[PDB]
Ligand binder design. Structure first.
Ligand SMILES: CC(C)c1cc(C(C)C)c(S(=O)(=O)O)c(C(C)C)c1
Length: 134
């Protein structure tokens, strides 16, 4: 077992706050914001040895990233940014930093009660997305 096993499973989005403003701050275009904001994704998290895989499945896009903690990788985001990503564990929280074009955003994933809580931060703007077990 690892502690990261707490994240493993299939999760469904049940609430989203301030996601449009987060996307605006990130630089997402109008039409993409509207369609992505409407999405109600499932997040599927799995672990196999040192490799963590996070999938997002929705009517908008199906994305998948696989990574090793602390080890940088190239990611193409759902809004088609090409970013350099590093994901680490900090006191039980998965911290995902994306860097592109001199900009940076941080996505934190944490377990709270029976929920998985995702905090998306771009400068001073924070969006909170809450998922429950599917
Ligand atoms: C449009 C961009 C900024 C975006 C889209 C999505 C989905 C709606 C595909 C997500 S997430 O996969 O729901 O966490 C996320 C997370 C990783 C913040 C970001």
């Amino acid at each position: 077992s690892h502690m990261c096993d707490a994240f493993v499973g299939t999760w469904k989005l049940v609430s989203s706050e301030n996601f449009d403003d987060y996307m605006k701050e990130v630089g997402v275009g109008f039409a993409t914001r509207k369609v992505a904001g409407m999405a109600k994704p499932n997040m599927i998290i799995s672990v196999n040895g040192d490799v963590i895989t996070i999938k997002s499945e929705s009517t908008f896009k199906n994305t998948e990233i696989s990574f090793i903690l602390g080890q940088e990788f190239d990611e193409v985001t759902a809004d088609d940014r090409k970013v350099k990503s590093t994901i680490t564990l900090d006191g039980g929280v998965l911290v995902h930093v994306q860097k592109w074009d001199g900009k940076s955003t941080t996505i934190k994933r944490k377990r709270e009660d029976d929920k998985l809580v995702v905090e998306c931060v771009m400068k001073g703007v924070t969006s909170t997305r809450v998922y429950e077990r599917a």
